[PDB]
Amino acid sequence: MTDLRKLEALQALHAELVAVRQHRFEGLQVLETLLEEQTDAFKALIAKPARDTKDREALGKEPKKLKIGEEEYSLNEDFVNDCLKLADELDLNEKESARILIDCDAEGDVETQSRPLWECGVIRFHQERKYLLDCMRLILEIAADEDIDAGLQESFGVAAEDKIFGIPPPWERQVKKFIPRCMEAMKGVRSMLQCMADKANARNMLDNQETLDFSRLSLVEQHECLASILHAAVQRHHATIADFQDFIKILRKWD
Amino acid sequence: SSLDNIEMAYARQIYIYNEKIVNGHLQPNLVDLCASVAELDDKSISDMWTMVKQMTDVLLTPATDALKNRSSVEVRMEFVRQALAYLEQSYKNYTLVTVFGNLHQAQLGGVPGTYQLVRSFLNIKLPAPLPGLQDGEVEGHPVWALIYYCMRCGDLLAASQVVNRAQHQLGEFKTWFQEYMNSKDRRLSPATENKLRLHYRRALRNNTDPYKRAVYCIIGRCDVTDNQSEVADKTEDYLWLKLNQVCFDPQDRLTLSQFQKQLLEDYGESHFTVNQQPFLYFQVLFLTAQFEAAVAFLFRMERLRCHAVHVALVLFELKLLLKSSGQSAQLLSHEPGDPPCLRRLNFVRLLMLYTRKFESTDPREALQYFYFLRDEKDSQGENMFLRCVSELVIESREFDMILGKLENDGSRKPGVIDKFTSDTKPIINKVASVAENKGLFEEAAKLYDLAKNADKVLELMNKLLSPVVPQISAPQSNKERLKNMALSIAERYRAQGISANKFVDSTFYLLLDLITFFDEYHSGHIDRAFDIIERLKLVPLNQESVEERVAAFRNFSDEIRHNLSEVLLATMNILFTQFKRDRDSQLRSQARTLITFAGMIPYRTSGDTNARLVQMEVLMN
Numbered sequence: 001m002t003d004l005r006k007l008e009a010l011q012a013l014h015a016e017l018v019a020v021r022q023h024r025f026e027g028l029q030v031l032e033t034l035l036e037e038q039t040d041a042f043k044a045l046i047a048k049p050a051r052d053t054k055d056r057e058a059l060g061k062e063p064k065k066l067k068i069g070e071e072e073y074s075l076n077e078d079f080v081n082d083c084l085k086l087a088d089e090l091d092l093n094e095k096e097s098a099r100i101l102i103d104c105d106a107e108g109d110v111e112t113q114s115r116p117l118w119e120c121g122v123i124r125f126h127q128e129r130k131y132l133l134d135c136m137r138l139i140l141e142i143a144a145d146e147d148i149d150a151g152l153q154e155s156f157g158v159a160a161e162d163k164i165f166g167i168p169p170p171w172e173r174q175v176k177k178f179i180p181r182c183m184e185a186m187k188g189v190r191s192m193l194q195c196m197a198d199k200a201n202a203r204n205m206l207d208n209q210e211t212l213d214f215s216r217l218s219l220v221e222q223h224e225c226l227a228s229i230l231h232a233a234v235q236r237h238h239a240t241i242a243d244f245q246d247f248i249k250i251l252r253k254w255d
Numbered sequence: 256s257s258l259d260n261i262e263m264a265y266a267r268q269i270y271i272y273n274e275k276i277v278n279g280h281l282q283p284n285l286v287d288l289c290a291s292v293a294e295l296d297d298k299s300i301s302d303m304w305t306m307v308k309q310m311t312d313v314l315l316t317p318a319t320d321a322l323k324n325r326s327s328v329e330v331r332m333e334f335v336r337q338a339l340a341y342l343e344q345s346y347k348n349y350t351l352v353t354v355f356g357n358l359h360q361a362q363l364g365g366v367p368g369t370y371q372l373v374r375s376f377l378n379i380k381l382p383a384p385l386p387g388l389q390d391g392e393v394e395g396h397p398v399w400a401l402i403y404y405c406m407r408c409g410d411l412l413a414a415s416q417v418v419n420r421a422q423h424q425l426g427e428f429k430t431w432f433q434e435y436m437n438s439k440d441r442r443l444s445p446a447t448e449n450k451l452r453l454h455y456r457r458a459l460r461n462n463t464d465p466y467k468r469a470v471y472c473i474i475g476r477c478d479v480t481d482n483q484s485e486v487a488d489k490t491e492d493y494l495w496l497k498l499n500q501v502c503f504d505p506q507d508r509l510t511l512s513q514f515q516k517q518l519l520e521d522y523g524e525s526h527f528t529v530n531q532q533p534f535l536y537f538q539v540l541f542l543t544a545q546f547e548a549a550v551a552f553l554f555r556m557e558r559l560r561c562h563a564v565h566v567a568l569v570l571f572e573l574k575l576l577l578k579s580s581g582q583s584a585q586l587l588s589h590e591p592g593d594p595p596c597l598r599r600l601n602f603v604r605l606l607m608l609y610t611r612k613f614e615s616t617d618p619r620e621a622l623q624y625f626y627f628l629r630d631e632k633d634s635q636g637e638n639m640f641l642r643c644v645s646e647l648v649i650e651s652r653e654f655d656m657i658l659g660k661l662e663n664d665g666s667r668k669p670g671v672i673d674k675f676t677s678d679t680k681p682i683i684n685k686v687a688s689v690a691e692n693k694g695l696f697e698e699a700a701k702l703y704d705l706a707k708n709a710d711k712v713l714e715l716m717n718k719l720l721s722p723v724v725p726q727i728s729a730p731q732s733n734k735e736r737l738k739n740m741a742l743s744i745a746e747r748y749r750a751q752g753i754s755a756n757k758f759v760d761s762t763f764y765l766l767l768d769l770i771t772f773f774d775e776y777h778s779g780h781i782d783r784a785f786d787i788i789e790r791l792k793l794v795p796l797n798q799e800s801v802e803e804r805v806a807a808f809r810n811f812s813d814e815i816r817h818n819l820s821e822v823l824l825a826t827m828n829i830l831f832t833q834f835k836r837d838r839d840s841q842l843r844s845q846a847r848t849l850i851t852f853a854g855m856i857p858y859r860t861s862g863d864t865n866a867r868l869v870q871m872e873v874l875m876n
Contacts, residue, residue, distance in 0.1 A: 040615055047557060052260010053295065068256075069616055095256050174586045174604020176555045184557050245525060 005103050007124055009038060010131035017138035021145075025152070035163060042136065042163040045185045045226070046129050048092050055094035059083060068099055079105075082118035090125060090192075100124050119211055126218040133225040136164050140232045165233060178233060179243050186226050193219055257613040258620065262561045264292040266620040269568075273623050277674050285572050286311060289565045299534060300562060302345070307566050309341045310334065310541060311573055321574045325597065328503065331511060331544065332440070335498050338542040339441075342495035343409025350376045350408060369410035370417070373401055387463035390424045393417055398424065399466035403486060406473065407495065411436045435474050441499060443474065452477050469496075476500045479509040490527075490535055494542055512596045515543040524552065533559060546570050547577055547600040551587040554605065564609045568627060571602060578602045582633065603631060603639065610643075618653050619671055626675055644672055645685045654702065658683060661705040663743040665751065680706050691715065697737070700744075709748060710755040713763040716741055720766040721814035725821035728774050738770055762812040765791065769818065776825045785829050794826055795852050796845045805855050820864045823853050831871045839875075846872040 004012060013034045016027045035042070063080040066073045079101065087097040104110060104120045113120065142148070143156040161167040165178045193216070200212060233239075258266060268288045275283055290304035313333045315324055324330050347369070348358070354375050355361035367375065377396045388397040398421045405414035418425060418432055431451050435443055442448070452475045460478075462468055465485035472478040479500050487496045502508050509517075518539060527536035533556050540549030550570070554563035570576035579588060579601040586601050593599070606624055614621040625647070628639035648657055658679070659670030672679060687702035696715045703711040719737050728734040745767060747753075754760045768791055775784035788794060793815075795804040808816065827849055834842050850872060853865050 040611070043611065049257070049259035050261065050558065052263065054260045054263060056260075093259055173583070174601045174606065175608040176586070180555050181557065242523075242525070249525070249529070 005106070006041075007103060007127055008107075009034070010041075010128060010135065013038065014131045014135050014138075017135055017142070020148075020152075021138055021142055023148075028152075035159060039163065041132055043166060045133060045136075045181060046188065046222070047185075048090070048188075049096050051087060051091055051093055056084075056087075059094045059098075066098060068095070068102065073102060079117070082116075082121065085118045086121040086125075089122065092125070097121065115207070115211070119208060122215060123211065126215055129222050130218050133222050133229070136160070137225050137228050137232075139164070140229065144232075164229070165238070179230070179239065182226060182230050182233075183243075183246065186223060186230075189219055189223050189226070257616055259561075261292065261296060262613070263620075264295060265289065265561055265565060266617075266623060268292060269623045270620075273626055273675075282572075286569045289569065303534060303537070303562065303566075306341055306538060306541060307569060309337050310544075310546075311569060311575060313337060315574065317574075319574065321577055322593075324574060325544075325577060332503070334544045335501060335511065336440075339495060339498050340409065341542065342491050342498070343407065345491060346495070347372075347408040350404070353379060369405060369408050369413040370401075373404045373408065373413065376404060377401070387465075389462065389464040389467055390421065393421050397464075397466065399464055399470060402470050403466045403473075406470065407492070432474065442476070448475055451475050473499050476502060477507055479507060490539065494539065498542075511544065515545050516596050518543065519545065519548060541566075545598065546575065547587060547598045550576075550600055550605075554586070560609060564605065564624075567600065567602065567605055571627060576600060576602060578631075603628060614647055615651065618647060618651050618657055621647060622657070622671055622675070629675075640675070641682050641685075645682050645689075648682070648686045649689055654686075654705075658686070658702075658705060661701075663740075663747075665747050667705070684708065684711075687711070697740075700740075704744060707753065709753050710759060712744065713755045713759045716744065717759065717762050717766065717812065717814045720763075720770065721817055724766060724769050724818045725773050725825070727777050728770075734770075738767075741767060741770075758812065762814055765793075765815060769815075769822065772822070773825065776829065781829050781832055785826075785833070788822070788826055788829075794822060795848050798844075798848055798851070801848065801852055801855070804852060808856055808858075816858055819856065819858045820860045823849055823864060823868060827868050827871050831875070834875045843872075843875055846875055 001008075013031075016031045016034065019025075019027050020031065059075075059080065063075040063077070066075050082101055083094055083098050086092065086101060087094050090097070092100075100121045101117060104117060104124060109120055109124075110117055113123075139156050139160050143153060143160060145153060158169050162169055166175060167178075196212075196215075256263075268291060272283060272285055272288055275281065286304065286308045290301065290308065293301045293304045313330060315330070350372060351358060351361045351366070354372065355364075366372070374394065374396055377400050381400070384397075388399070390398050392398065393401060398417060401417045402414045405411070405417065415432065415436055418429055422429055431443070431447060434447055435441070438444065443451070451471065455471045455475065455477065459467070459471065465483065468478075468481075469483045469486045472481070472483070473496070476499065479497070482493060483496055487493050497509070497514055500509055501511050501514055503510065524536055527539055533553065537549045537553050540546070540552065546566075550563050550567045552563075553559050553566070556563070567576060571578075577597065577599045579590070579599040582601065582603050584599075584601050586604055587598055588601070589595060589598050606628060610621050610624055622644065625640050625643040628643060631639040633639060633642065644657070648654065651657070654660070655670075657670050657672055659668050659673060661667045670679075672682070683702060683706035687699050687706065687708070690702060691699035691711070696719050700712050700715045700719070703715070720741060723734045723737055726732075726734050728738060741763075745764070755763075768787060772784055772787045772791075775787065789796065792800070792804070793807075795801045808819070827846070830842050830846055830849075850865070850868050853861065853868055858864075
């Protein structure tokens with residue numbers, strides 16, 4: 001299709017990167033078109049809006065009609081309950097959490113997996129971070145491939161400098177560097193995984209066991225992807241002594 | 256929506272502050288407008304704005320440069336006092352919650368006098384007597400403990416009362432302290448200041464009473480290296496201990512410049528963020544007048560971006576923020592021709608980052624933040640606010656919302672930018688200009704038509720029509736969708752008496768007539784279509800007009816000469832049909848005329864056309 005949502009956009013983009021990596025350049029013109037539509041996605045690696053009270057009190061006060069962007073939806077007593085549940089488990093904003101659940105109703109994945117609607121929101125949320133971060137590794141990996149055309153090898157290189165590292169190209173040009181965002185990004189994965197075991201162990205001490213396992217797998221994969229991206233960025237001599245000292249301190253504080 | 260609960264509330268407050276300046280009203284207190292949302296969050300944020308207000312609530316020189324206010328020893332001195340007053344009051348609240356479990360609990364029973372509070376504070380924090388205390392006690396507590404924590408809370412009077420009940424024990428300290436309380440700026444006279452310092456240094460450099468040590472060099476601003484760690488164990492106790500020791504114009508002396516630089520240079524973020532508590536470092540920088548450092552620092556915490564941008568705005572609407580002239584610099588930097596102890600914030604970049612997050616699906620709120628850039632320009636001269644609105648429209652493609660939709664009835668419902676400036680002619684051309692450069696003519700026309708720039712509207716409308724002139728106008732086709740907009744532009748341009756130069760304009764109304772000529776020709780209304788082409792006097796029908804019509808073709812718009820081929824054939828096929836239905840001589844004569852015209856005109860597909868024209872004339876005979 002052409003009007004793909006965020007999830008379908010990242011899943012389709014991932015397939016294109018694999019083609020170029022597996023010596024298949026049949027999607028060059030289609031690849032460049034995706035990086036421009038997801039420019040805002042590559043800028044921020046992973047960032048969940050903090051849970052606000054304005055939407056919490058407003059969502060439950062008039063759970064009749066919801067307006068997200070240009071489209072409109074109708075909320076019922078059943079769907080509204082899934083929004084508060086998803087927002088609490090992941091500590092995500094009600095507006096952002098609702099959009100995730102709406103994407104499941106449209107695509108209709110509840111029947112493909114046969115799971116509660118509120119649980120699908122957790123999987124859909126983790127899939128975004130997976131492809132959003134995993135696709136970045138392919139860009140840098142292809143940009144360093146020596147067994148491809150020199151021209152194509154340089155296209156993905158300059159693109160990653162601006163899309164991932166937020167560094168504009170040489171033909172042009174308050175903002176925060178990439179490393180400090182990556183360090184804080186990985187930090188959120190650790191705090192989210194730690195609070196997950198504490199809460200999960202409390203209730204465990206069900207039909208969601210496999211979902212929790214898949215979420216842990218996605219989290220560890222995202223952490224590995226972030227580590228690889230950090231290594232690649234450091235390989236371009238884009239670090240300093242402060243980051244080294246911070247990493248040494250984090251290692252010294254390893255438990 | 257890309258804005259979290261906290262960020263959204265701030266946006267609304269910034270809309271008010273803009274609505275006030277857009278309607279010329281009183282410039283309200285921005286710091287108050289931001290603290291209004293802070294109370295909706297945990298007190299971690301409220302206590303920040305409390306510090307922001309008290310650190311910025313200094314008598315300034317309105318209409319004065321930012322760099323000048325921040326370099327003046329006059330202002331630099333009041334900063335230290337405003338901070339000390341915050342560290343003292345802040346500590347006073349710590350002393351309340353230490354004695355009473357809740358601020359509310361203390362209030363219902365009544366806040367006791369700073370003296371009795373401190374006494375009820377010593378009971379807890381030292382239950383048993385330390386064997387190293389000196390000068391006895393006062394009403395059951397060591398006299399020096401009372402003096403210190405009273406001065407720490409900022410109530411010198413409460414401390415002096417303690418001294419009055421121990422006149423015999425404290426010796427000459429009474430006449431010295433009574434002078435400190437009297438003299439302003441928390442400084443003694445050089446003569447008396449010398450008398451006490453030498454006495455302390457003489458045989459009290461190492462005394463077993465730490466509280467005695469602390470008070471003496473807080474009064475004398477001595478032993479700056481000794482952090483009095485026995486009594487000042489917290490970070491705020493250190494800041495407060497030093498700001499009571501800074502001096503102004505060589506040994507055993509510390510100045511704000513040294514202290515402010517000494518802190519972050521030697522003990523940077525690393526030292527103050529090991530406990531993963533960000534505000535601790537922010538308070539260190541903000542309460543030392545290093546506002547740019549604290550702003551950039553706090554702006555990097557992805558959870559506290561909102562707060563750091565606004566504390567920058569406050570410093571910006573108070574002529575206190577030191578902006579970086581060059582926009583190519585990093586977020587934080589020290590100008591080459593400035594002293595090393597001050598730093599500069601690239602304010603333009605700061606807002607540009609914050610905006611990109613929610614500029615995509617929340618344009619209205621973005622503009623409210625772009626307004627603060629109204630006073631700045633770039634290397635090319637464009638007004639930064641205007642440029643930011645251009646880029647935001649090119650990307651968001653929100654024309655009706657931001658620029659005002661110009662309906663096809665002649666109305667211009669204003670847009671969101673109309674609030675900020677009434678001269679909206681340039682950007683509408685800027686946005687129309689790029690979309691024109693991207694072959695989006697149908698849009699560039701609507702945009703140029705929104706700014707009543709008929710020179711460009713009709714130009715583009717000429718290009719969109721010429722290809723579709725001979726085509727078949729069918730429901731929902733590209734002809735109908737373009738013809739119907741062209742006619743909606745013909746009426747609104749006649750009813751309002753608007754027109755471009757005659758070249759662009761003549762061609763535009765000429766194509767509209769031709770579009771009618773083929774719409775009648777394709778419908779079989781031969782008689783009606785023949786009459787139209789006759790009026791236009793574009794194709795000669797009597798031999799006498801050939802000379803003049805041929806000369807006219809030379810200077811007619813190529814958007815017309817292009818369609819000459821189809822016009823001659825339709826006109827011929829028109830005469831052709833009417834022949835099969837004196838009149839015969841008249842059609843025959845006109846048939847000839849078209850041929851000779853086409854023979855003398857070099858035009859598109861003259862080969863196939865001139866041949867077909869001749870064949871159709873032969874069948875007539």
